[PDB]
Design an enzyme around this catalytic site. Structure first.
Site, PDB file in Angstrom:
ATOM      1  CE  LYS C 154      -2.497  -0.618   3.514  1.00  0.00           C
ATOM      2  NZ  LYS C 154      -1.819  -2.039   4.192  1.00  0.00           N
ATOM      3  CD  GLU C 180       1.985   7.160   6.964  1.00  0.00           C
ATOM      4  OE1 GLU C 180       1.760   6.414   6.239  1.00  0.00           O
ATOM      5  OE2 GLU C 180       2.394   8.404   6.620  1.00  0.00           O
ATOM      6  NE  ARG C 181       5.156   0.233  10.034  1.00  0.00           N
ATOM      7  CZ  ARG C 181       3.915  -0.093   9.262  1.00  0.00           C
ATOM      8  NH1 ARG C 181       3.508   0.787   8.441  1.00  0.00           N
ATOM      9  NH2 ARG C 181       3.609  -1.368   9.220  1.00  0.00           N
TER      10      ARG C 181
HETATM   11  N1  ADP Z   1       7.042  -2.618  -5.753  1.00  0.00           N
HETATM   12  C1  ADP Z   1       7.723  -3.600  -4.905  1.00  0.00           C
HETATM   13  N2  ADP Z   1       8.454  -4.281  -5.241  1.00  0.00           N
HETATM   14  C2  ADP Z   1       9.429  -5.116  -4.464  1.00  0.00           C
HETATM   15  N3  ADP Z   1       8.997  -5.068  -3.096  1.00  0.00           N
HETATM   16  C3  ADP Z   1       7.673  -4.467  -2.546  1.00  0.00           C
HETATM   17  C4  ADP Z   1       7.104  -3.435  -3.399  1.00  0.00           C
HETATM   18  N4  ADP Z   1       6.058  -2.876  -2.955  1.00  0.00           N
HETATM   19  C5  ADP Z   1       6.124  -3.444  -1.382  1.00  0.00           C
HETATM   20  N5  ADP Z   1       7.101  -4.500  -1.504  1.00  0.00           N
HETATM   21  C6  ADP Z   1       7.431  -5.092  -0.202  1.00  0.00           C
HETATM   22  O1  ADP Z   1       6.704  -4.745   0.794  1.00  0.00           O
HETATM   23  C7  ADP Z   1       7.329  -3.905   1.836  1.00  0.00           C
HETATM   24  C8  ADP Z   1       6.978  -2.596   2.235  1.00  0.00           C
HETATM   25  O2  ADP Z   1       5.448  -2.682   2.207  1.00  0.00           O
HETATM   26  P1  ADP Z   1       4.697  -1.485   2.664  1.00  0.00           P
HETATM   27  O3  ADP Z   1       3.639  -1.374   1.172  1.00  0.00           O
HETATM   28  O4  ADP Z   1       5.252  -0.683   3.077  1.00  0.00           O
HETATM   29  O5  ADP Z   1       3.424  -2.140   3.647  1.00  0.00           O
HETATM   30  P2  ADP Z   1       1.800  -1.681   3.603  1.00  0.00           P
HETATM   31  O6  ADP Z   1       1.460  -1.890   2.323  1.00  0.00           O
HETATM   32  O7  ADP Z   1       1.311  -2.777   4.575  1.00  0.00           O
HETATM   33  O8  ADP Z   1       1.803  -0.520   4.362  1.00  0.00           O
HETATM   34  C9  ADP Z   1       8.910  -3.977   1.654  1.00  0.00           C
HETATM   35  O9  ADP Z   1       9.898  -4.356   2.615  1.00  0.00           O
HETATM   36  C10 ADP Z   1       9.014  -4.433   0.368  1.00  0.00           C
HETATM   37  O10 ADP Z   1       9.751  -5.898   0.444  1.00  0.00           O
HETATM   38 MG    MG Z   2       1.874   1.671   5.247  1.00  0.00          MG
END
Ligand code: ADP
Ligand code: MG
Ligand code: ATP
Ligand code: MG
EC number: 7.1.2.2
Lengths: 47, 53, 469, 498
Positions: C154, C180-181
């Site tokens: 996300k 959020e963080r």
């Molecule tokens: N486009 C991408 N390519 C590779 N890995 C990704 C990508 N998007 C997210 N990730 C993986 O997801 C993690 C980050 O997720 P994040 O989107 O920050 O969490 P959330 O969606 O729950 O807020 C990263 O550590 C990475 O490994």
């Molecule tokens: Mg997030």
């Protein structure tokens, strides 16, 4: 309570991993064959 | 060999379907128990919150 | 008017007024605090008492502390001077750069636009992401959702959208971090400073930031969304211009509302949510709209507690969005990133009369082939790939090629993958998928299509794979 | 003889000053919660004291009475007692004076060994650092476990989560991380020294005693604080212990130093908070937890920051430990803390019993920092290892052609490489050497059941004959071309000779 398509791999039990591997091995083999053919075509079409 | 193989595949599939049916029965019983338990749990949470005001 | 704290329970403060009561939603200022603590009135309990939610920590409050009544809801500074800054729920700056010097203060509570103000025009907004553009195309002025649990992409996806649309977007832009963080807030601040949307020297900033992270008490998380929404609303109206509004996540608004409901005397509903979940979410999501006076493109990240799309919060949020892109963990495990689920994503404009018959037919062909693949996966679990009809194997091969080809490398995910970001124009995505379906590539291996931009890059990657075979 | 004399030295200095203090009468005491009447000027979450020297915290400020939670046993408080307000929000001692001391949730020494010489106090309930003080996570926090330092790396200022079932190996990872920091703390540079804090919540005193003696054996109490709020400690103490430990670590990060804090578990702080909230009569929520159960943790894990160089540059890592029920990660508190933290480390019993220890499920374990906060040598090698295991996991469920057969062989070799023992963390360069040997197709000749042997033996060789190479890798922090050529010849020679 019903059942839907693509549920065996939604559970992720043993059948799910078994099916995933059965698919991956086959398509790895076919990718190898297609890559060999692609190399052969490359060489044969260089000229 | 092909005749016997097809017969054996028919028998094996019959047994596999029978085992899947037994497993489906057991899991349906478990699912009904769990569904009722979840309904009761959520309802008791609501009741406790309502009476704890 | 002047009142007097009479109870403090968690984040809920009961304040007694000897003169006239303040109306609901008014902001009250606690007298005797080193910092600024603002309570917001939420109920009249009779006997001159009013219950309130504190927009800050209620530590060190004393039964009897005097309270002032501002007479108006929380009024935040609005205008072009907020651009490049950061703000609280109550509008004071938290970027350590001095006061925000505006002439206009806007109250964060307002009525939603009336029905005689709705724009009914839709036109695709090309984001440069293959899956989004093909299957769930966005729309200018429409509200976008980004559902998905934790760790699916996300934040990365929304950062990628800010990188693309916002950078090359003439109008302004607002970012509301809701619960959020704080690490991510700092990272975004610095990434924008580096990119240039936030300019600390001149007055050319194009982004206004509002933050109420997850260290804040529920009162502040439940209202920072309204603060960001107020900034966006002002830029929509007075400035009379296009706006983007990114929110991350809009599930923390609901959750923060749920952390105080039980203390306000409401019986819980459903799975321990406040009884006013749908109304509280509607009175907010109904001000994020493209009236005839402006145009807000709203992108929202929506946490789905435990991947459960049937939870009351995401389930209710579904009805307030034009486009949705349900990121899926089962696809992120496979390494397909962004993990957008092609069958669980939808858009309103996805009709043959808005996008075109070629685009629509390509999208529907892709969705149908993926659904057929799902149907086949059940059989392959018992037979095996070796026993499929020589036509079914063709469906499986096309489906896997299409599954990989939807993956794409972002310019913000360089750190993870190490690859380089690609932006794929819409025509190139349509051509790529139409060709993959038509069979013009049923000889290249699957892995050639994994994490590449246009289709020609897949051909080049396959050539490299064959040469180093 | 002098024993009585030092006893007198204690009387010689007393607390003559009696002051005129505000008070209140205990209307009702029962279950650990008192309802005081009076204390008109008592603040919220202030510390009050009872007639028997027993402390408490004024949590509820109702119009007619103050709901106070007693930090200790409750049998000694009668009705109509006297509660004196101390006029100070709950705060704990902080400083280097606490290092090597076992203390309770309120900062009282618990192991005898005298008192704490702390010269400063810090409020438990302090707000997290803003958005501006922080700076992205740069340095690596060396954990010593190969599978954590290679596949799910942890930086300094990150907030990893160790989540699993009961008895999968979570406290073991915590103790390995604590013990590993000995090499850095013994050295000279202060930019690598990491002071460790271990918060033990709801663990029986025997477990904490075992843990403390284990740290003493590894000579790791020179820099460790242990804040124990064991099971027999009233709920108001297990509730407050994480915040006390976090203040003790906030002191370090606020002064340019680096700290590591390990809450263990947070799933028991949640239970203690629920008990408190239910005995104050606050309405319950989902699974009976109060509504403010997410806040409880989010405000606590948001204090693990990475200050920029203007604010000292200090950091405070955090490794909360959660406990799931039969792997139901989808529960309530597990999901809350999963959406609060950065990375995760999933330990699974199916992997614990299949022989993979630590059970770290590398497939699901994540770390947002990833690239950053990893040494260049580890970054070079663990990347290829990660790709190889990712490919292996796809084609693992079964067990033909040469290519995929060798892929499975390499995957299995790496898997048996990642295993490890207990309380024997490895230096980063040693991990790099082992992983390099494994991933450069050298072990593909060996049987897999023998890999562990090689591993052990290899180190005991390199650790003596080739100390210079390991020092080179550590100092330069990368596998240079000459270093790579050396590593190559060492591994080629050793493999044949074994
Ligand atoms: N486009 C991408 N390519 C590779 N890995 C990704 C990508 N998007 C997210 N990730 C993986 O997801 C993690 C980050 O997720 P994040 O989107 O920050 O969490 P959330 O969606 O729950 O807020 C990263 O550590 C990475 O490994
Ligand atoms: Mg997030
Ligand atoms: N790397 C390892 N190698 C061998 N054994 C291990 C390893 N890690 C853990 N164990 C074993 O697992 C057992 C439990 O370890 P540990 O206490 O770390 O898990 P835990 O989940 O914290 O337990 P609990 O949650 O019940 O306190 C120990 O007895 C130990 O022998
Ligand atoms: Mg343990």
């Amino acid at each position: 309570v019903r059942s839907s398509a693509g549920a065996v791999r939604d559970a992720g039990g043993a059948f799910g991993k078994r099916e995933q591997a059965e698919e991956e091995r086959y398509f790895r083999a076919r990718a190898k064959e297609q890559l060999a053919a692609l190399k052969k075509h490359h060489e044969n079409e260089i000229s | 060999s092909t005749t016997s193989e097809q017969s054996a595949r028919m028998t094996a599939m019959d047994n596999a379907s029978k085992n899947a049916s037994e497993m489906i029965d057991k899991l349906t019983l478990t699912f009904n128990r769990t569904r009722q338990a979840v309904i009761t749990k959520e309802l008791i949470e609501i009741i406790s919150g309502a009476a704890a005001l | 008017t002047t009142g007097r704290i009479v109870a403090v329970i968690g984040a809920v403060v009961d304040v007694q007024f000897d003169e006239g009561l303040p109306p609901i939603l008014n902001a009250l200022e606690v007298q005797g605090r080193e910092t600024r603590l603002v309570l917001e009135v939420a109920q009249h309990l009779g006997e001159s008492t009013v219950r309130t939610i504190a927009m800050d920590g209620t530590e060190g409050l004393v039964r009897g502390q005097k309270v002032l009544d501002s007479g108006a809801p929380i009024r935040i500074p609005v205008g072009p001077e907020t651009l490049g800054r950061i703000m609280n729920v109550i509008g004071e700056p938290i970027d350590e750069r001095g006061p925000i010097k505006t002439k206009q203060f806007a109250a964060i509570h307002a009525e939603a636009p009336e029905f005689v103000e709705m724009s009914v025009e839709q036109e695709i907004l090309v984001t440069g992401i293959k899956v989004v553009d093909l299957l769930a195309p966005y729309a200018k002025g429409g509200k976008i959702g980004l559902f998905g649990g934790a760790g699916v992409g996300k934040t990365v996806l929304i950062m990628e959208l800010i990188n693309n649309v916002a950078k090359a977007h003439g109008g302004y832009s607002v970012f509301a971090g809701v619960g959020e963080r704080t690490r991510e807030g700092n990272d975004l601040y610095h990434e924008m400073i580096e990119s240039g949307v936030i300019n600390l020297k001149d007055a050319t900033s194009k982004v206004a930031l509002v933050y109420g992270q997850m260290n804040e008490p529920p009162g502040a998380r439940a209202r920072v969304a309204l603060t960001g929404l107020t900034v966006a609303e002002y830029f929509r109206d007075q400035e009379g211009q296009d706006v983007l509004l990114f929110i991350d996540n809009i599930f923390r608004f609901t959750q923060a509302g749920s952390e105080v409901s039980a203390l306000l005397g409401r019986i819980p509903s459903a799975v321990g949510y406040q009884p006013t979940l749908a109304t509280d979410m509607g009175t907010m999501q109904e001000r994020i709209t493209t009236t005839k006076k402006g145009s807000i493109t709203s992108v929202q990240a929506i946490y789905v507690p435990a991947d459960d799309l049937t939870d009351p919060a995401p389930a209710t949020t579904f009805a307030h969005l034009d486009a949705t892109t349900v990121l899926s963990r089962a696809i992120a495990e496979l390494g397909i990133y962004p993990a957008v689920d092609p069958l669980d994503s939808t858009s309103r404009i996805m009709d043959p009369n808005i996008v075109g018959s070629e685009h629509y037919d390509v999208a529907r062909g892709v969705q149908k082939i993926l659904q057929d693949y799902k149907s086949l996966q059940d059989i392959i679990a018992i037979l095996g790939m070796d026993e499929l009809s020589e036509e079914d194997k063709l469906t499986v091969s096309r489906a896997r090629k299409i599954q990989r080809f939807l993956s794409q490398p972002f310019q913000v995910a360089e750190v993870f993958t190490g690859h380089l970001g690609k932006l794929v124009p819409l025509k190139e995505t349509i051509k790529g998928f139409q060709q993959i379906l038509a069979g013009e590539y049923d000889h290249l291996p699957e892995q050639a299509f994994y994490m590449v931009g246009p289709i020609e890059e897949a051909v080049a990657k396959a050539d490299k794979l064959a040469e180093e075979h | 003889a002098e024993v009585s004399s030092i006893l007198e030295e204690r009387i010689l200095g007393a607390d003559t000053s009696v002051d005129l203090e505000e008070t209140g009468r205990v209307l009702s005491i029962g279950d650990g919660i008192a309802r005081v009447h009076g204390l008109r000027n008592v603040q919220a979450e202030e510390m009050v004291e009872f007639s028997s020297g027993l402390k408490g915290m004024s949590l509820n400020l109702e119009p007619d009475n103050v709901g106070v939670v007693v930090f200790g046993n409750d049998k000694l408080i009668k009705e109509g007692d006297i509660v004196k307000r101390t006029g100070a929000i709950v705060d704990v001692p902080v400083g280097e004076e606490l290092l090597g001391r076992v203390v309770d949730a309120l900062g009282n020494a618990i192991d005898g060994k005298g008192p704490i010489g702390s010269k400063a106090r810090r409020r438990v309930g302090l707000k997290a650092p803003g958005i501006i003080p922080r700076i992205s996570v740069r340095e690596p926090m060396q954990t010593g476990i190969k599978a954590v330092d290679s596949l799910v790396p942890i930086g300094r200022g990150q907030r990893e989560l160790i989540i699993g079932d009961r008895q999968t190996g979570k406290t073991s990872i915590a103790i390995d991380t604590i013990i590993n920091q000995k090499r850095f703390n013994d050295g000279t540079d202060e930019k690598k020294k990491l002071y460790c804090i271990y918060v033990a919540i709801g663990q029986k005193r025997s477990t904490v005693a075992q843990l403390v003696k284990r740290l003493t054996d590894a000579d790791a109490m020179k820099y460790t604080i242990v804040v124990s709020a064991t099971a027999s400690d009233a709920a108001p103490l297990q509730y407050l212990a994480p915040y006390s430990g976090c203040s003790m670590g906030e002191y370090f990060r606020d002064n340019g130093k680096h700290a590591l804090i390990i809450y263990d578990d947070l799933s028991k702080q949640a239970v203690a908070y629920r008990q408190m909230s239910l005995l104050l009569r606050r309405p319950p929520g989902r699974e009976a937890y109060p509504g403010d159960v997410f806040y409880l943790h989010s405000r606590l894990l948001e204090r693990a920051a990475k200050m920029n160089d203007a604010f000292g540059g200090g950091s405070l890592t955090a490794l909360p430990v959660i406990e799931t029920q039969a792997g139901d990660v989808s529960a309530y508190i597990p999901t809350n803390v999963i959406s609060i933290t950065d990375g995760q480390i999933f330990l699974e019993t199916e992997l614990f019993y299949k022989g993979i220890r630590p059970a770290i499920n590398v497939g699901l374990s994540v770390s947002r920092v990833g690239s950053a906060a990893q040494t260049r040598a580890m970054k070079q090698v663990a990347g290829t290892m990660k790709l190889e295991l990712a490919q292996y996991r796809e084609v693992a469920a079964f067990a033909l052609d040469a290519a995929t057969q060798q892929l499975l062989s390499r995957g299995v070799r790496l898997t048996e490489l990642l295993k490890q023992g207990q309380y024997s963390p490895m230096a980063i360069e040693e991990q790099v050497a082992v992983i390099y040997a494994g991933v450069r197709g050298y072990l593909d000749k060996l049987e897999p059941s023998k890999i562990t042997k090689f591993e052990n033996a290899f180190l005991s060789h390199v650790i003596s004959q080739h100390q210079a190479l390991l020092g080179k890798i550590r100092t330069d922090g990368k596998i240079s071309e000459e270093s790579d050529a050396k590593l190559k010849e060492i591994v080629t020679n050793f493999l044949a000779g074994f």
